[PDB]
Structures are given as structure tokens and as C-alpha cells.
């Protein structure tokens, strides 16, 4: 990815204000509710039949925090997403078989959740920088597929 210092700063500042408990579960839960085929990969988390089941599932909430933790690392190594995410890419490709299109979907859901959580502070320019970040993470995660 190619971010200017201004984008870098804006991205970094907002991120330091994120409540991971609240954002992580919302992000993951919304992915499972919105794009229901994704539930196939999380069968071991239990019951995910309805929105209320999903959003109230403690495993979904816990895992969501982990996911956010991985985003934190990429934000801390913006010039080397490919290296930062190599292990996770392996996990996702080889062991889980997740199609890379879903990395993009999750990134987009994360963007809606940030807007939901931050309201007006999630301005158009800040969203534009976040779009670059999510694109980069998605690409980095798709690395072992090629």
C-alpha cells in the first residue's frame, strides 16, 4: 500500500481510540449475519442460526477481538503487510480454505463498524485511508494462494 503521512496519521489516531471489545465482536458477528455462507467456517462456535444467536455468541465475541489484534499488527507494519501476515495467510489458505474474496468482505464490514462506532468522526478522507489499509491486509492474506 501507498499511504501519505497524513493518511498514516489519521489511520493511527483513530485506531488508538477503538474499543476492541465493542468493535471486534460487531465486525465478526456482522460478517456472519450479512454473508451467511461464512458461518460454514465457524460451525465449531456453536449456534449461529439467527442474528441474535450470532451476536450473543461469546466465541464470536472473543474471536472478534483476536481478529482485531491482527489488524493492529498490520497497522504497526504498514510497509510490510506481506511479511506481517504470512503465517495467518498460511492458516487461512492451507488449513482453512477460505476464499480470498471473504477477506475483502470482512474489511468492508470492518469499515461500516468503524463508521457505526465513530459516527461523524469517520470522515470521507479517513474512510478513504482505511479502504487502502483493508485492501492491503486482504491482499497480504491472499499471498499463499498464489
Amino acid at each position: 500500500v501507498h499511504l501519505t503521512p497524513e493518511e498514516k496519521s489519521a489511520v493511527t489516531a483513530l485506531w488508538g481510540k477503538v474499543n476492541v471489545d465493542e468493535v471486534g465482536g460487531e465486525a465478526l458477528g456482522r460478517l456472519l449475519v450479512v454473508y451467511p455462507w461464512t458461518q460454514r467456517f465457524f460451525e465449531s462456535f456453536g449456534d449461529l442460526s439467527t442474528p441474535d444467536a450470532v451476536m450473543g455468541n461469546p466465541k464470536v465475541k472473543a474471536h472478534g477481538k483476536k481478529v482485531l489484534g491482527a489488524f493492529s499488527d498490520g497497522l504497526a507494519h504498514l510497509d510490510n503487510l506481506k511479511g506481517t501476515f504470512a503465517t495467518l495467510s498460511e492458516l487461512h489458505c492451507d488449513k482453512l480454505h477460505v476464499d480470498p474474496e471473504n477477506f475483502r468482505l470482512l474489511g468492508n464490514v470492518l469499515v461500516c463498524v468503524l463508521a457505526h462506532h465513530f459516527g461523524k468522526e469517520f470522515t470521507p478522507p479517513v474512510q478513504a485511508a482505511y479502504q487502502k489499509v483493508v485492501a492491503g491486509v486482504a491482499n497480504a492474506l491472499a499471498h499463499k494462494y498464489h
Partner: protein, 141 residues
Amino acid sequence: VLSPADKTNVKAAWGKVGAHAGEYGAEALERMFLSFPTTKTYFPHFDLSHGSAQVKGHGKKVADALTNAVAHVDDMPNALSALSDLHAHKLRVDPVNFKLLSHCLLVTLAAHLPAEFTPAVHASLDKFLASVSTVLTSKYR
């Protein structure tokens, strides 16, 4: 499909948008132009600057059409036919762009209507926007 639960969700969220519909359409367009610069080519003669009166005005037209789509939920292919003609035959808009705008509209709604943008409403809104997009790209197959 757009199940009656979905229809209800759409109607309630849209009703809450109410009078700010044009402002929301304008914001979603500005979000799209900045996030996905490739979409700007379709508006050569427009002032795309932030706060531009033209973006505001266009935003209002978009909002109106969505208002109309919500009102004709069950008969969208008919209520939007002219629009499909415009977008697919005349303008030749790349289908991918409808996804981009749908995403941007969702982001706008989430930023302005936090209490209403629940997971279930989000799902309903995504399905609705996908439907509108399918109708507007129907001339490509």
C-alpha cells in the same frame, strides 16, 4: 429474497432517514469519489470538490430514486426501468461500481443512524441495495 422481514427493515430505516435523504445521498457520493477515484470519470463536467452544489444536487436525485425503490419494493424492475436504461445502455457503468456505491451508502447510514443500524437492519439494507444494483445492471445480463 427480499423477505417481508427485510421489507419491513428497509422501510423503517429509510423512514428514519426521512428528510436527510439528499444530504445522505451526497455524502455517499463524496465517500465513493474519494475512496474509489476510478468512479470520478463518470462525472467529467461536475465540480467534485467537497461541498460542491452539483454533488449535493445529484445526491438528492439518487436519494429520490432510492425513496422510490423503497416505495416500489415489490415491483422495482418496473419502477427503475428508465434508470437501468440510463446506466447500462447509455452510460455503460461498470457493474462493480454499484457495489462500491452500495458500500458507501451503508457506511453513511451507519455513521448517521447508529441506533437503527443493527445487524439485522444492516443485512436487510445490503440485500435491498444488491437488488437495486441488479435491476440497474440488468441490460448486461
